[PDB]
Amino acid sequence: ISPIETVPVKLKPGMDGPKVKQWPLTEEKIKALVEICTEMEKEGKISKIGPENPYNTPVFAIKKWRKLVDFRELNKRTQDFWEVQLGIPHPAGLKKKKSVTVLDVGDAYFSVPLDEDFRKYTAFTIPSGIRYQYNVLPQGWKGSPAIFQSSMTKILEPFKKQNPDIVIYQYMDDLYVGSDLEIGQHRTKIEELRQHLLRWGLTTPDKKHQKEPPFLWMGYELHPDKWTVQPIVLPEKDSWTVNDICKLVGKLNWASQIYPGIKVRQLSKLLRGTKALTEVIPLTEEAELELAENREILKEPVHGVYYDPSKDLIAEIQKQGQGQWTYQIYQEPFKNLKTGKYARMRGAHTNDVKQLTEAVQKITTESIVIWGKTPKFKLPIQKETWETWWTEYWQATWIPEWEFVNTPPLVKLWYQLEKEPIVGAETFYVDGAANRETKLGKAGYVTNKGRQKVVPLTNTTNQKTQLQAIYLALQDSGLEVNIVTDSQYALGIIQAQPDKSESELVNQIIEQLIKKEKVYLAWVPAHKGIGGNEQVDKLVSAGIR
Amino acid sequence: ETVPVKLKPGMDGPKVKQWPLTEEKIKALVEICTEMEKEGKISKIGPENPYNTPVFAIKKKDSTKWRKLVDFRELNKRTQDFWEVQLGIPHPAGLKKKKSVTVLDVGDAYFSVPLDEDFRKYTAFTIPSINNETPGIRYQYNVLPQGWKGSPAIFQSSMTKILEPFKKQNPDIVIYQYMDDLYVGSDLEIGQHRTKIEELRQHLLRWGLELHPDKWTVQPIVLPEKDSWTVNDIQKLVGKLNWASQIYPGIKVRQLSKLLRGTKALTEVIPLTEEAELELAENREILKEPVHGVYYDPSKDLIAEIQKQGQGQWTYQIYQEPFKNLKTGKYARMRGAHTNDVKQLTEAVQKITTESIVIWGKTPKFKLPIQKETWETWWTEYWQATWIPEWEFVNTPPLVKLW
RNA sequence: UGGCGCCCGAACAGGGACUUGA
Ligand SMILES: Cc1ccnc2c1NC(=O)c1cccnc1N2C1CC1
Ligand SMILES: [Mg+2]
């Protein structure tokens, strides 16, 4: 009693069905397999084909014995299917439901008939062989999930059409049915759905066996009115390995979406340049406190709320230093739908404003995925500071909607390069050259007063030579300088106004730039006899060229 | 009889992933897709079709009704041979010389003819669901899809007979449809041109179906002019001219650089000598002339670069090879209220491509100066064109940004 | 046995900046 339409399945073009000899199994395995096949055949989902069909697929039973058929060759030969539900719904995007069930559909893929022209391709043999074939979707097959999902969607369509209030979600085989009605009528509606599915052959557990809330789904603990992640337990040990810190980082990342203020930047940094899993990397001083603070965050229960379409969506971003941003997406105060963190320094040179914009992009992209609308942000950056940034920036940055929240860690531009030359300052023509093979470079500057300087550099690339030359200009000078660097890379490094950088040399450069009250960074093409640049290359290139 | 359609050899159906959409866009899409299915334009499909195409909903200019567009760029590339060689639309070279050109919309006429059964599976698209709480509704096109470059190629057979009475009654009117639109150009008065367009529109409604190209002028590079030439000003001028030498072979900076021999402060007003005055005059004369040796190559796809000059001013260059700008312009801001940059970039992209379609008949490959996530999320909101060009995201070098 | 999220590494392709030799 399964009147379900069979989805046509066609083999890939130019390839024929699997032809693999079934490796002999032990006597116990053979007896278990034949017993399982005999009963399954009785159910009507298995039939005998004899030697007429040449295709075959090996089988093996894994300990009762659970039969497993490896469709490796068939999965790589069947036409690609479109698994529409590639992702999963975040709990924050759901809505408060008064009552919900799970309705775990028994024999999910074993109740949907298989295409009549394709059953001969899923053939398999049982050693004495007794060849069989699947008349329904077999477990482990590539097309079994997509076809079953479509079959259930079509089965639920007549019921969902007549029950608009009831919300039904199918992940793999469980049907999370939310009604928002009274428990007395909700149970009756569930019974109606259970009988409707039974009409199509699908079986569901009795009301006495229905799982009670909260429902453990994909790492979450979903109560009818609130959601939370599964209990996160951080190992308490001293000898921390790469694999163990991997577990710690992944678990903290999972908890980050609800628990606020979780930092994983230091722990992730501990994974740089490490390959073997047995490397006993001791927790650094900068990361031990961070781990203890996270343990303090995770030592209490934090329960999120569900989306309310009749309320405004807010996303208050916060800054905790070291290029780490935390956002609490909430609709009502202290009722965060879902917290998060954006610890990702895109590129080696970025500032707070650019990082904040990237965090905004991340929040907008996920909010649209989860809620389909961009939240009303509450950023800490001043309105004028943002205007000063995006108007004098080369990208098309734009923040949709946001007010100003006066949190202690405000976002600001630490320094701004002068737009015009400085009258009365001292010009610094800075350049550097690095030897091609010896890796020895030089950096120097020349000024109007005649000041000269050249510092030998070792194991420094050419780019670092230009950066060092600028650093020297920022060091041996006053509060007003007109640096003339003939390297476009240096301009890219400085004109972007990075608040912090991965490299220490740039960090020193920006540290000196902040001190300067007025700094101007000009540019002249190299090898053109322009001003003091030729007199600088004549100094910084003596033993290099 | 449906015209057979086959993809390019060795190419398989478009398996693109749908970009997430806002609640308003998803609701509108379902509202209009259900009506399309009711009318037979599209039909539902099962899970046996692995081909998907992105779908976005937009509000057409001077309209409030949602207009679905399908990102058929990947399919257009797959069917490139078919719509570029098997069936093609000749480009009238006189369209770009017309006083007034109006971009009509004849895309609704493609639904009047069926699509080849063996090709419908490649036009499938998915409508995303909010939060993925329910599987996205999957459809396929039973008729010539809008936005697919093969649709105008197949429909040109009926289009020629549709426009024949008008093309014969008004031989001075040049008509050229690229993807879904219908560029009508004429050397008539604006009021009379609109009257003619109204007559053409009636000619299209019976069968069941603004631009000023003469106002387009290149934006030549102009050097700054001032009486006090400080060392920094000359340093910037020399650098700009040195970069311009790649575009203009005749640019020379030997005399200008001769003035900067010694080490001098950036705020020193060094006076230009007679030889340098002549050198600057020659550079000015060269920079106010079209680039020599540059010609359009139909076999090479156009490339468009966009720069953000700031204060709402955007400069763009269309070229096929580096330093071979076929057309340089400046997109003065039209909307944005000094607060939106993505909206202005989208408007610039639409204007640039519309110019390319009118001139060369193809959409240039864009190099947008914008973050991938910012554009991918907000380009669909301000988009109002039935067509989509190819774009890539790159970082604009500071030197070439000075125009 | 496969898929998915994140990190590290390598081989890849093009785009940009720069150095040296011819
Ligand atoms: C795991 C899951 C995924 C998507 N939606 C839901 C659920 N499960 C729930 O328990 C749930 C809880 C609260 C509201 N909706 C819920 N449901 C909806 C169906 C009623
Ligand atoms: Mg040099």
XYZ file of N, CA and C in Angstrom, chain B residues 212-220 316 327-330 355:
45
model
N 20.711 58.471 -25.506
C 21.150 59.482 -26.466
C 22.574 59.134 -26.875
N 22.738 58.193 -27.809
C 24.095 57.817 -28.243
C 24.912 58.984 -28.763
N 24.279 59.948 -29.436
C 25.005 61.116 -29.919
C 25.529 61.977 -28.779
N 25.005 61.799 -27.568
C 25.461 62.543 -26.404
C 26.621 61.861 -25.695
N 27.074 60.714 -26.193
C 28.168 59.975 -25.578
C 29.483 60.443 -26.189
N 30.392 60.916 -25.342
C 31.709 61.357 -25.777
C 32.755 60.798 -24.826
N 33.895 60.384 -25.386
C 34.966 59.848 -24.560
C 35.449 60.910 -23.571
N 36.070 60.440 -22.491
C 36.595 61.304 -21.442
C 38.119 61.334 -21.511
N 38.709 62.167 -22.367
C 40.170 62.194 -22.471
C 40.808 62.685 -21.182
N 35.188 54.803 -15.825
C 35.259 53.456 -16.367
C 35.991 53.472 -17.700
N 36.771 52.786 -25.017
C 35.879 53.864 -24.602
C 36.127 54.184 -23.137
N 36.445 55.444 -22.854
C 36.648 55.935 -21.498
C 35.590 56.984 -21.196
N 34.934 56.852 -20.042
C 33.884 57.771 -19.659
C 33.901 58.036 -18.168
N 32.915 58.816 -17.729
C 32.769 59.183 -16.326
C 31.292 59.157 -15.968
N 25.607 50.835 -22.864
C 26.449 51.486 -23.866
C 27.197 50.469 -24.713
